[PDB]
Each structure stands twice: as C-alpha cells, then as structure tokens.
Amino acid sequence: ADLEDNMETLNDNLKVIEKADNAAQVKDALTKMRAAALDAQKATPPKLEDKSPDSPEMCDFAAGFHILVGQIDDALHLANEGKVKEAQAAAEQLKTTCNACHQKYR
C-alpha cells in the first residue's frame, strides 16, 4: 500500500482503540497498525523525494517507525494480558511519536 493508505489505516485504528470496549478489539487494531507502520517505513515521503537512502533524513524517517512499532508492541503486550484501559493509555502516548514525525516530514 502507499504512504497515504498506511496513514489512513494508522489513523482509523487509533480511533477504533479510543472507542474500543474490550481487549480483543484493541489487540486487533494494534496488529493492523503494526502492519501499516512497517509498510510505511518502506515508502519515500514526498518531502524527502530527492534524498539518498543513506541520508540522515531518510534514516531518521525510517527510525521514526522503528520507535512507533516498538510502542505498538508495548500496547499489544498489555492488550494481550487483557489490561484494556492501560492498553488504551499506551495507545494515546503513540500520538507524540506521530506528531514528532509529522513536524519534520509531513
């Protein structure tokens, strides 16, 4: 999928988690988000069109998603243990990683 799709996926399922009622729904949402983040990590964003894959920006862009997956994994651990409310808390905290990347490269 392309960068925009992956970000829609990211956005939707974060809402799904905010709304969500029980553990299984949160776990499902995060798993889709995981997939998306990993896919987005492959894409070259428009603002980095002309930069070499080796460039600090490209590397820092890729690194952004490595952080994000790391955090989704944190939330999945919780969701997995059925700790729904703090799974949601973990998911909230993702938002800072999203905005941080958006300020640089969106």
Binding-site positions for heme b: 7, 102
Q: Which helix (H) or strand (E) holds 58?
A: helix 56-80
Lookup: tokens for 7: 């970000």
Considering the rule CB under 6 A, would residue 42 count as an interface residue with ligand PXX?
yes
59 binds, among ligand HEM, Ni ion, ligand PXX, none (CB under 5 to 8 A by kind): ligand PXX
∠ CA 10-84-13, nearest 5°, is: 15
CA distance 17 to 27: 9
Interface residue with ligand HEM, options 17, 20, 65, 76 (CB under 6 A): 65
Piece of the chain touching Ni ion by CB under 5 A; list 12-20, 34-42, 74-82, 94-102: 34-42
Is 101 among the residues that bind ligand HEM (CB under 6 A)?
A: yes
Q: Are 6 and 69 in contact (CB under 8 A)?
A: no
Token look-up 């925009």 returns 4
Q: Where do contacts with ligand PXX occur on this chain (CB under 6 A)?
A: 42, 44, 53, 58-59, 61-62
